[PDB]
């Protein structure tokens, strides 16, 4: 399990679900535990409290790897990005750095026209 005290928190938030996973410094993932991975399948899949449980569900089950510090990367908007960081503050992990890595294109790809 490499006993890696360091950690990297790749948090991908969407408007329907929150993707919570912890990878190493090189980005190889340890494990993923999402809001759809802790019940709440359907209406309640976009909730910061459901993102809170998903932040807890990935906080544990990686305890074999022995992580105490992490740098936080947040991608995409959604119910997360303002509550899982509070969950990670209360998870016991060191909040070393919070970096917003939401990708902003320079209007290269044309968006669709849905939801009329």
């Amino acid at each position: 399990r490499k006993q890696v005290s360091d950690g990297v928190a790749h948090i991908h938030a969407s408007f329907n679900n929150t993707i919570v996973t912890i990878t190493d410094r090189q980005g190889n993932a340890l494990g993923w535990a999402t809001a759809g991975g802790s019940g709440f399948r359907g209406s309640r899949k976009s909730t910061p409290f459901a993102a809170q449980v998903a932040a807890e569900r990935c906080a544990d089950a990686v305890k074999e790897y022995g992580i105490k510090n992490l740098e936080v990367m947040v991608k995409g908007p959604g119910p997360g990005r303002e509550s899982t960081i509070r969950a990670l503050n209360a998870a016991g992990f060191r909040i070393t750095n919070i970096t917003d890595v939401t990708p902003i294109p320079h209007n290269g790809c044309r968006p669709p026209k849905k939801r009329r």
Binding site: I85, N89, I98, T99, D100, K113
Partner: protein
């Protein structure tokens, strides 16, 4: 956007995440390019914005405020 907020912060308060937009182009790039409605919707909103400051000049009446 990228900040450690020093060592003993214990709370994010990352105002630079919301300083740029945090949802502006993050919702602008979602859908409805439309190629002329952003031209249209920036006309009347700026028309309303000038009118809001034009109707801000309605204090000159007595009004018994």
């Amino acid at each position: 956007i990228k900040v450690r907020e020093n060592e003993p912060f214990d709370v994010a308060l990352r105002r630079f995440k919301r300083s740029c937009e945090k949802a502006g182009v993050l919702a602008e790039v979602r859908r409805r390019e439309f190629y002329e409605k952003p031209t249209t919707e920036r006309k009347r909103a700026k028309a309303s914005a000038v009118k809001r400051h034009a109707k801000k000049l309605a204090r000159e009446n007595a009004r018994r405020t």
